[PDB]
Design an enzyme around this catalytic site. Structure first.
Site, PDB file in Angstrom:
ATOM      1  N   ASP A 240       0.789  -1.221   0.000  1.00 35.25           N
ATOM      2  CA  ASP A 240       0.000   0.000   0.000  1.00 35.25           C
ATOM      3  C   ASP A 240       0.832   1.286   0.000  1.00 35.25           C
ATOM      4  O   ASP A 240       1.262   1.759   1.041  1.00 35.25           O
ATOM      5  CB  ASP A 240      -0.952  -0.019   1.201  1.00 35.25           C
ATOM      6  CG  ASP A 240      -1.986   1.082   1.130  1.00 35.25           C
ATOM      7  OD1 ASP A 240      -2.884   1.121   1.990  1.00 35.25           O
ATOM      8  OD2 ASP A 240      -1.902   1.907   0.193  1.00 35.25           O
ATOM      9  N   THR A 241       1.003   1.864  -1.184  1.00 32.54           N
ATOM     10  CA  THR A 241       1.760   3.103  -1.361  1.00 32.54           C
ATOM     11  C   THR A 241       1.078   4.305  -0.727  1.00 32.54           C
ATOM     12  O   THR A 241       1.718   5.334  -0.505  1.00 32.54           O
ATOM     13  CB  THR A 241       1.993   3.391  -2.854  1.00 32.54           C
ATOM     14  OG1 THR A 241       0.733   3.515  -3.534  1.00 32.54           O
ATOM     15  CG2 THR A 241       2.832   2.268  -3.483  1.00 32.54           C
ATOM     16  N   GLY A 242      -0.213   4.163  -0.411  1.00 28.84           N
ATOM     17  CA  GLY A 242      -0.962   5.240   0.208  1.00 28.84           C
ATOM     18  C   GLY A 242      -0.804   5.291   1.717  1.00 28.84           C
ATOM     19  O   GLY A 242      -1.258   6.242   2.340  1.00 28.84           O
TER      20      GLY A 242
HETATM   21  C1  MK5 Z   1      -7.466   7.656   2.968  1.00 30.25           C
HETATM   22  C2  MK5 Z   1      -6.194   6.884   2.643  1.00 30.25           C
HETATM   23  C3  MK5 Z   1      -5.105   7.209   3.663  1.00 30.25           C
HETATM   24  C4  MK5 Z   1      -4.318   8.464   3.242  1.00 30.25           C
HETATM   25  C5  MK5 Z   1      -4.196   6.000   3.907  1.00 30.25           C
HETATM   26  N1  MK5 Z   1      -4.964   4.742   4.012  1.00 30.25           N
HETATM   27  C6  MK5 Z   1      -4.329   3.699   3.185  1.00 30.25           C
HETATM   28  C7  MK5 Z   1      -5.266   3.417   2.000  1.00 30.25           C
HETATM   29  O1  MK5 Z   1      -4.581   2.723   0.961  1.00 30.25           O
HETATM   30  C8  MK5 Z   1      -6.490   2.613   2.443  1.00 30.25           C
HETATM   31  C9  MK5 Z   1      -6.127   1.164   2.809  1.00 30.25           C
HETATM   32  C10 MK5 Z   1      -7.382   0.406   3.256  1.00 30.25           C
HETATM   33  C11 MK5 Z   1      -8.002  -0.475   2.378  1.00 30.25           C
HETATM   34  C12 MK5 Z   1      -9.146  -1.161   2.762  1.00 30.25           C
HETATM   35  C13 MK5 Z   1      -9.673  -0.968   4.035  1.00 30.25           C
HETATM   36  C14 MK5 Z   1      -9.058  -0.085   4.915  1.00 30.25           C
HETATM   37  C15 MK5 Z   1      -7.909   0.594   4.525  1.00 30.25           C
HETATM   38  N2  MK5 Z   1      -7.481   2.600   1.362  1.00 30.25           N
HETATM   39  C16 MK5 Z   1      -8.564   3.365   1.324  1.00 30.25           C
HETATM   40  O2  MK5 Z   1      -8.867   4.182   2.190  1.00 30.25           O
HETATM   41  O3  MK5 Z   1      -9.387   3.212   0.250  1.00 30.25           O
HETATM   42  C17 MK5 Z   1     -10.396   4.223   0.291  1.00 30.25           C
HETATM   43  C18 MK5 Z   1     -11.559   3.800  -0.606  1.00 30.25           C
HETATM   44  N3  MK5 Z   1     -11.923   2.406  -0.320  1.00 30.25           N
HETATM   45  C19 MK5 Z   1     -11.755   1.458  -1.231  1.00 30.25           C
HETATM   46  O4  MK5 Z   1     -11.262   1.673  -2.337  1.00 30.25           O
HETATM   47  C20 MK5 Z   1     -12.179   0.039  -0.831  1.00 30.25           C
HETATM   48 CL1  MK5 Z   1     -10.682  -0.912  -0.658  1.00 30.25          CL
HETATM   49 CL2  MK5 Z   1     -13.092  -0.033   0.719  1.00 30.25          CL
HETATM   50  S1  MK5 Z   1      -5.156   4.214   5.581  1.00 30.25           S
HETATM   51  O5  MK5 Z   1      -5.451   2.760   5.565  1.00 30.25           O
HETATM   52  O6  MK5 Z   1      -6.282   4.986   6.205  1.00 30.25           O
HETATM   53  C21 MK5 Z   1      -3.689   4.519   6.500  1.00 30.25           C
HETATM   54  C22 MK5 Z   1      -2.650   3.596   6.484  1.00 30.25           C
HETATM   55  C23 MK5 Z   1      -1.487   3.848   7.202  1.00 30.25           C
HETATM   56  C24 MK5 Z   1      -1.355   5.023   7.937  1.00 30.25           C
HETATM   57  O7  MK5 Z   1      -0.203   5.247   8.639  1.00 30.25           O
HETATM   58  C25 MK5 Z   1      -0.111   6.602   9.100  1.00 30.25           C
HETATM   59  C26 MK5 Z   1      -2.396   5.945   7.957  1.00 30.25           C
HETATM   60  C27 MK5 Z   1      -3.559   5.692   7.238  1.00 30.25           C
END
Ligand code: MK5
EC number: 3.4.23.16
Lengths: 99, 99
Positions: free
Chosen positions: A25-27
């Site tokens: 996860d690059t995000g």
């Molecule tokens: C709003 C994004 C945010 C900037 C970073 N997110 C990582 C994302 O890639 C997140 C990963 C995730 C995937 C599925 C469930 C929960 C978390 N993805 C995400 O928010 O997708 C948003 C839209 N949702 C979808 O596309 C589907 Cl997967 Cl539900 S995160 O999980 O909230 C995160 C991760 C690590 C972190 O460390 C500081 C802080 C936050």
């Protein structure tokens, strides 16, 4: 290897003696794992994304193998819906984005 | 380009004729942008993240230029913490993970 993004980039990780599936996860700044009862000292932390914040336990210098590549660093443990490998470990395994 | 992950993979995008910064986010299925106006019809939708669910506006078949590469696809608009480019558009621009 090269991982396309047609599907979720889930890979097998090894941590604390468990094998798990986790998203590359690059995000994600940090690595966030589903609740697991790891030994050792930890620090409380809150991390935020879509929906708001969750409470996690911060463990440091934890060895973790990702798709056969060794890494070691901070892992956050709490009620995440999915195991997330963040940039803190992605850098360690030489992962890049390419287009 | 090849983008390493020591810093957040932020890029400039063009959408609805305006420039914005957005995060290349392999952990996101979908592309979610902070509140903004876009032309055309939208559908009410809900989307999940690490902290729960939010309400978004789903815009379909929207052109967006991401770091010089064209995509046209679904864009979700709502209270995301950061503009995120998800897999639905990362695939269009030929983005892969490599290590
Ligand atoms: C709003 C994004 C945010 C900037 C970073 N997110 C990582 C994302 O890639 C997140 C990963 C995730 C995937 C599925 C469930 C929960 C978390 N993805 C995400 O928010 O997708 C948003 C839209 N949702 C979808 O596309 C589907 Cl997967 Cl539900 S995160 O999980 O909230 C995160 C991760 C690590 C972190 O460390 C500081 C802080 C936050």
């Amino acid at each position: 290897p090269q991982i396309t993004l047609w599907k979720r980039p889930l890979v097998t990780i090894r941590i604390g003696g468990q094998l798990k599936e986790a998203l590359l996860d690059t995000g994600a700044d940090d690595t966030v794992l589903e609740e697991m009862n790891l030994p050792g000292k930890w620090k409380p932390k809150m991390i935020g994304g879509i929906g708001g914040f969750i409470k996690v336990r911060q463990y440091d210098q934890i060895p973790i193998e990702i798709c056969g590549h060794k890494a070691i660093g901070t892992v956050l443990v709490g009620p995440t819906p999915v195991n997330i490998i963040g940039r803190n470990l992605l850098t360690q395994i030489g992962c890049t984005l390419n287009f």
